[PDB]
Symmetry: D2
Subunit: 114 residues, 4 copies
């Protein structure tokens, strides 16, 4: 139900071995860890959660872009990229969070399908 895909706008490639952390907003407004992993050779991260676990709520996907750029020897602007959204059962069942990274910029979209 929740996939992440990360691309590199400098190399023209998937962004490989990027750390990704997902958090769920708790009742006291703190961010509780929920799932995490590293993107694969295709820039994708699957298997974060399951339909049972992924209930409605506010989630934050933190992509560790700074470490990615540093591993390539490139000087970056951002500490990380953030994607904060509400999971909604009224819409389609599968969320893909896609991000496109540059040293001083990032873009993100949601692809929400059944």
């Amino acid at each position: 139900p929740l996939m992440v895909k990360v691309l590199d706008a400098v190399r023209g490639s998937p962004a490989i071995n990027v750390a990704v952390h997902v958090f769920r907003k708790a009742a006291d407004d703190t961010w509780e860890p929920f799932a995490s992993g590293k993107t694969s050779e295709s820039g994708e991260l699957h298997g974060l959660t399951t339909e049972e676990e992924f209930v409605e709520g506010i989630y934050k996907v933190e992509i560790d872009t700074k470490s990615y750029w540093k591993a390539l020897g490139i000087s970056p602007f951002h500490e990380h990229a953030e994607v904060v959204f509400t999971a909604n059962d009224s819409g389609p069942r599968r969320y893909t969070i896609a991000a496109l990274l540059s040293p001083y910029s990032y873009s993100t979209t949601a692809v929400v399908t059944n």
Copy 2:
């Protein structure tokens, strides 16, 4: 060797049934038709060409964004989106041209892999 993928930033969905035309630049600097198709339910267009046909050269991928927006009842800015690039045998063998569409904006990247 050449895939196109198109996403919709308004609906948060693949951009389905978008017409895509690929042209190759000819010796007299005109654009000759090369391949075309329409994106699938996943927003993807496969099977445009083959490794034998897809020789080095300058190619233009024209995505008919205006008709896409009009079919959804949305008033667009651009006539089409353009992606013009040189195919290079020194780099990886597979090109994916990805585009993310909004009514007054578009973004595109290349994902070039082996």
Copy 3:
């Protein structure tokens, strides 16, 4: 030294009346309020801070995109757009944080200059 500019990719316009909150990470690792404001008719937000006050640190610029889209009667995907960066770590710089908004997407870039 810290300005924000926000554009609307649906309308082809500045994104007017967008709330922006800036935080700075404190020594205890919490996010301290730093400055806030709203974009103008030009999509710009000036006057958040001063060179004196804008010291080195890790800053988070939170752009309230959901509130923007909801005020236009649209149900968007994201809660906000966040831009988190270390500022002034090799002396003072001037930063422009630009964002381009759509209901299910946003993009951001920084323009950093040395006065």
Copy 4:
């Protein structure tokens, strides 16, 4: 009535000295030269045309991104960034065409205002 602004997503800066060519589609469907120029130190290009000359039509703004990246010693993917649009079809408007460049990617948006 027609301005261009170009930013560099690698440097976090304006994209300076970027060549821009504007064409207009003619009655025979060819692309006629219309105006050209280069971005300044601020990444901006003003003075391309005049309200008199900028009549209704289909315009193509070609941003010479490959030449930019090559001048910086970088081998980029795209030949150029193209922005093709119908202008002034419900009377005069003022257009800003903005682009954000990376070696394998670009994004563009339009800001359209009614004077």
